[PDB]
Design an enzyme around this catalytic site. Structure first.
Site, PDB file in Angstrom:
ATOM      1  N   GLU A 104      10.037  44.380  45.743  1.00 28.23           N
ATOM      2  CA  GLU A 104      10.809  45.431  45.081  1.00 28.23           C
ATOM      3  C   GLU A 104      10.233  45.871  43.728  1.00 28.23           C
ATOM      4  OE1 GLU A 104      11.741  42.178  45.656  1.00 28.23           O
ATOM      5  OE2 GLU A 104      12.990  41.465  43.989  1.00 28.23           O
ATOM      6  N   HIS A 107      16.608  46.951  52.076  1.00 32.42           N
ATOM      7  CA  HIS A 107      16.639  45.770  51.218  1.00 32.42           C
ATOM      8  C   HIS A 107      15.883  46.026  49.912  1.00 32.42           C
ATOM      9  CE1 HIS A 107      17.085  41.418  50.495  1.00 32.42           C
ATOM     10  NE2 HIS A 107      15.928  41.545  49.843  1.00 32.42           N
ATOM     11  N   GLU A 108      14.622  46.522  49.993  1.00 34.73           N
ATOM     12  CA  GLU A 108      13.842  46.816  48.786  1.00 34.73           C
ATOM     13  C   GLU A 108      14.510  47.880  47.908  1.00 34.73           C
ATOM     14  OE1 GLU A 108      12.046  44.261  48.409  1.00 34.73           O
ATOM     15  OE2 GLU A 108      11.891  43.809  50.556  1.00 34.73           O
ATOM     16  N   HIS A 150      17.413  46.460  45.804  1.00 38.69           N
ATOM     17  CA  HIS A 150      16.918  45.739  44.626  1.00 38.69           C
ATOM     18  C   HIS A 150      16.828  46.602  43.368  1.00 38.69           C
ATOM     19  CE1 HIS A 150      16.193  41.636  45.587  1.00 38.69           C
ATOM     20  NE2 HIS A 150      15.334  41.860  46.580  1.00 38.69           N
ATOM     21  N   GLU A 178      19.224  37.855  45.528  1.00 37.54           N
ATOM     22  CA  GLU A 178      19.131  38.096  46.975  1.00 37.54           C
ATOM     23  C   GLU A 178      20.438  38.282  47.693  1.00 37.54           C
ATOM     24  OE1 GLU A 178      16.547  39.226  48.069  1.00 37.54           O
ATOM     25  OE2 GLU A 178      15.143  38.546  46.520  1.00 37.54           O
ATOM     26  N   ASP A 214       7.594  28.639  44.769  1.00 33.17           N
ATOM     27  CA  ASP A 214       6.991  29.022  46.052  1.00 33.17           C
ATOM     28  C   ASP A 214       7.311  28.052  47.194  1.00 33.17           C
ATOM     29  OD1 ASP A 214       5.881  31.344  44.990  1.00 33.17           O
ATOM     30  OD2 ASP A 214       3.904  30.452  44.708  1.00 33.17           O
ATOM     31  N   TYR A 254      19.253  34.051  50.243  1.00 33.46           N
ATOM     32  CA  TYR A 254      19.525  35.315  50.934  1.00 33.46           C
ATOM     33  C   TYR A 254      20.825  35.233  51.734  1.00 33.46           C
ATOM     34  CZ  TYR A 254      14.614  36.819  50.147  1.00 33.46           C
ATOM     35  OH  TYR A 254      13.420  37.160  49.571  1.00 33.46           O
TER      36      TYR A 254
HETATM   37  N1  LIG Z   1      11.480  39.624  46.552  1.00 35.59           N
HETATM   38  C1  LIG Z   1      10.943  39.251  47.867  1.00 35.59           C
HETATM   39  C2  LIG Z   1      11.171  40.317  48.940  1.00 35.59           C
HETATM   40  C3  LIG Z   1      12.581  40.695  48.820  1.00 35.59           C
HETATM   41  O1  LIG Z   1      13.453  39.906  48.867  1.00 35.59           O
HETATM   42  O2  LIG Z   1      12.848  41.904  48.568  1.00 35.59           O
HETATM   43  C4  LIG Z   1       9.461  38.982  47.836  1.00 35.59           C
HETATM   44  N2  LIG Z   1       9.204  37.793  47.145  1.00 35.59           N
HETATM   45  N3  LIG Z   1       8.062  37.555  46.634  1.00 35.59           N
HETATM   46  N4  LIG Z   1       8.080  36.425  46.042  1.00 35.59           N
HETATM   47  C5  LIG Z   1       9.385  35.990  46.293  1.00 35.59           C
HETATM   48  C6  LIG Z   1       9.876  34.689  45.765  1.00 35.59           C
HETATM   49  C7  LIG Z   1      11.200  34.556  45.376  1.00 35.59           C
HETATM   50  C8  LIG Z   1      11.623  33.341  44.875  1.00 35.59           C
HETATM   51  C9  LIG Z   1      10.758  32.279  44.757  1.00 35.59           C
HETATM   52  O3  LIG Z   1      11.213  31.113  44.250  1.00 35.59           O
HETATM   53  C10 LIG Z   1      12.468  30.702  44.564  1.00 35.59           C
HETATM   54  N5  LIG Z   1      12.888  30.596  45.818  1.00 35.59           N
HETATM   55  C11 LIG Z   1      14.122  30.192  46.091  1.00 35.59           C
HETATM   56  C12 LIG Z   1      15.042  29.867  45.084  1.00 35.59           C
HETATM   57 CL1  LIG Z   1      16.669  29.374  45.385  1.00 35.59          CL
HETATM   58  C13 LIG Z   1      14.622  29.996  43.788  1.00 35.59           C
HETATM   59  C14 LIG Z   1      13.334  30.393  43.530  1.00 35.59           C
HETATM   60  F1  LIG Z   1      12.943  30.484  42.326  1.00 35.59           F
HETATM   61  C15 LIG Z   1       9.439  32.415  45.112  1.00 35.59           C
HETATM   62  C16 LIG Z   1       9.006  33.613  45.625  1.00 35.59           C
HETATM   63  N6  LIG Z   1      10.021  36.835  46.930  1.00 35.59           N
HETATM   64 ZN   LIG Z   2      15.224  40.550  48.260  1.00 39.50          ZN
END
Ligand SMILES: N[C@@H](CC(=O)O)Cn1nnc(-c2ccc(Oc3ncc(Cl)cc3F)cc2)n1
Ligand SMILES: [Zn+2]
Ligand SMILES: [Yb+3]
Ligand SMILES: [Yb+3]
Ligand SMILES: [Yb+3]
Length: 607
Positions: free
Chosen positions: A268, A292-293, A296, A315, A372, A380
């Site tokens: 996004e 979804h994007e 955001h 999310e 990551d 989500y």
């Molecule tokens: N934004 C999305 C696409 C979308 O949804 O529209 C693309 N995207 N790219 N990178 C990530 C991402 C998000 C969180 C990350 O870390 C964590 N994951 C879980 C928890 Cl609970 C906490 C965190 F910090 C790591 C990577 N998402």
């Molecule tokens: Zn998202």
């Protein structure tokens, strides 16, 4: 406190603006230049500050036209190295200074993927793209790499003249580089304050097509026409999202279709949503990713999580808004179908981690956890389940949408925690506090596993999926002849996908059943990435050796982690393909996105 950042927190100092001047060198795989940070002190007598960095080469730090003392601390694994800057003069509260840092990225920057021409559609030019979410902006430039800080930015990017640069900002012109006529400078402006994970850059042989009054689709020439068609409903979705969340404040809403190694379904990035080319199904059936994007632009980009522990705020609310966009376009039964599908993906995640796993909690604790590695469907779908449950408890979608709009208005341009959200929910629904006090908040927010209550879902569109899946699961060998291509005649692509998801949840099925499914349904011919992914997983988990080359091809010809990670894992768990899975990863590792390479490596236990 932000446990993922080593930088001075927002209570000490705040970055107000970034002026980025950089040059992209494809021969060295480096981004070189200056990051000029406008920093505001939040404290009296401030004499130093700390920034996040990761594998950056620092040349010098300039304040008031003079070089200042700085020090890089010991590396702290995935967090990178802290950079302490000695200020030349003590700062009073609210005083602003400009800190200009001359830096260079490492070719191994976890934020970037450098593509050779062979790895692009055109085969003549290289390509570069960034992915800063969650904490990779520090691998591009020194910053307070925390979503608790929001900043505006301006950027000037030098690239070989035959290429095009794009950023998460409004395009602000192009000129020949005055320092090098073999290069062009592309200018950008982001006037809306953003968290630094929303900073994005792409450099490649890009072309554009207009598909709406505020939307251009961008990709290499080979993908332009297909992308323009696939995403033609973009303006309609933006109009609905504006009706639900309030004004679109970002100006432009462009789309960029990345090369197949792009690690997520979408990103996004403000003014320029990034998308996987695996959305190019040919029938617009994977357009919910665009919804979804788009969503955001309100939840996440305007109202941001203060720390990554509160990521569900981002999310959960986005999935909620996304499902309302699809609900407005295709009806309430369709929104319920998508919501129920979401619950099933949550069951899958909870089963994969284990019901007591700390990552199944809604609010997480990322102390010493690489974000990551924590990434999953839980924030989500458990986030969505909570909001959908609250919607039903508080009087319906129209009433809950009133809360959503007020929530966006209240917290626009801010970074908030779960407590801030809950406090506002209680304030907005002050006349329903008795209903709100029946919610098991401790379980929903802080307990692992499936939520304590499952919401109510309309079954109209799901019934045919469950019925077909149950026919296959309960079938014995003498029932296989009864299946025919006519079983799918009244199913949409979404229903076909749900039929496969339902069946995959009970995998393995006998090998004879899977062979028969191909015989009568010809699932091998389907190019839709979602259907093909579930079908191949079903084949591999049901131990069909013929599926091994198909699964290996899908896992490597694209890099969307949602597909690549489970395909590699299923192939590693199947005895017949185990060695092939490991060897294929080993030969492709060097050419993979750095984050995808790390995670597939961990999944396969290959160091
Ligand atoms: N934004 C999305 C696409 C979308 O949804 O529209 C693309 N995207 N790219 N990178 C990530 C991402 C998000 C969180 C990350 O870390 C964590 N994951 C879980 C928890 Cl609970 C906490 C965190 F910090 C790591 C990577 N998402
Ligand atoms: Zn998202
Ligand atoms: Yb301008
Ligand atoms: Yb309160
Ligand atoms: Yb029988």
């Amino acid at each position: 406190v932000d446990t993922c950042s080593l930088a001075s927190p927002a209570s000490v100092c705040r970055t107000k603006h970034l002026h980025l001047r950089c040059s992209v060198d494809f021969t060295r795989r480096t981004l070189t230049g200056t990051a000029a940070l406008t920093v505001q002190s939040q404290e009296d007598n401030l004499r130093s500050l700390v920034l996040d960095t990761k594998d950056l080469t620092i040349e010098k730090v300039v304040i008031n036209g003079q070089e200042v003392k700085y020090a890089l601390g010991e590396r702290q694994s995935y967090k990178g190295s802290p950079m302490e800057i000695s200020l030349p003069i003590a700062l009073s509260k609210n005083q602003e200074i400009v800190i200009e840092i001359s830096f260079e990225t490492s070719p191994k920057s976890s934020a970037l993927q450098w593509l050779t021409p062979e790895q692009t559609s055109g085969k003549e030019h290289p390509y570069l793209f960034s992915q800063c979410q969650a904490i990779h902006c520090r691998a591009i430039l020194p910053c307070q790499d925390t979503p608790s800080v929001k900043l505006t930015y301006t950027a000037e990017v030098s690239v070989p003249k035959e290429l095009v640069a794009l950023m998460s900002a409004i395009r602000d012109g192009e000129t020949p580089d005055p320092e090098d006529p073999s290069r062009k400078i592309y200018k950008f402006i982001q006037k809306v304050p953003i968290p630094c994970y929303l900073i994005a850059l792409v450099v490649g042989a890009l072309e554009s097509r207009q598909i709406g009054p505020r939307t251009l689709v961008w990709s290499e020439k080979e993908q332009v026409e297909k992308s323009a068609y696939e995403f033609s409903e973009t303006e309609s979705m933006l109009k609905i999202a504006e009706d639900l969340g309030g004004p679109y404040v970002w100006g432009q809403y462009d789309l960029l279709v990345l090369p197949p190694s792009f690690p997520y379904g979408g990103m996004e990035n403000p003014c320029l949503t990034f998308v996987t080319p695996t959305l190019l199904a040919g029938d617009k059936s994977l357009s919910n990713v665009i919804a979804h994007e788009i969503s955001h632009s309100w939840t996440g980009n305007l109202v941001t999580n203060k720390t990554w522990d509160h990521f569900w705020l981002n999310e959960g609310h986005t999935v909620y808004l996304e499902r309302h966009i699809c609900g407005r376009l295709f009806g309430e039964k369709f929104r319920h179908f998508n919501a129920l599908g979401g619950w099933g993906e949550l069951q899958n995640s909870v089963k994969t981690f284990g019901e007591t796993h700390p990552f199944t909690k809604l609010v997480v604790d990322l102390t010493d956890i690489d974000p990551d590695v924590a990434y999953s469907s839980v924030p989500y779908e458990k986030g969505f389940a909570l909001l959908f449950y609250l919607e039903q408890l508080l009087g319906g979608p129209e009433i809950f949408l009133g809360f959503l709009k007020a929530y966006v208005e209240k917290f626009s341009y801010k970074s908030i925690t779960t407590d801030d959200w809950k406090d506002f929910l209680y304030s907005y629904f002050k006349d329903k506090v008795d209903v709100l006090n029946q919610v098991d908040w401790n379980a929903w927010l802080y307990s692992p596993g499936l939520p304590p209550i499952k919401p109510n879902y309309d079954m109209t569109l799901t019934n045919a999926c469950i019925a077909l899946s149950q026919r296959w699961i309960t079938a014995k060998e003498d029932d296989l002849n009864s299946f025919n291509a006519t079983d799918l005649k009244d199913l949409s692509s979404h229903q076909l996908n749900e039929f496969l998801a339902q069946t995959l949840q009970r995998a393995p099925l006998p090998l004879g059943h899977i062979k028969r499914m191909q015989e009568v349904y010809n699932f091998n011919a389907i190019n839709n990435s979602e259907i093909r992914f579930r079908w191949l997983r079903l084949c591999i988990q049901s131990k069909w050796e013929d599926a091994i080359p198909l699964a290996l091809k899908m896992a490597t010809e694209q890099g969307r982690m949602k597909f690549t990670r489970p395909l590699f894992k299923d192939l590693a768990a199947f005895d017949k393909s185990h060695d092939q899975a490991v060897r294929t990863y080993q030969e492709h590792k060097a050419s993979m996105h750095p984050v995808t390479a790390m995670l597939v490596g961990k999944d396969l236990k290959v160091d």
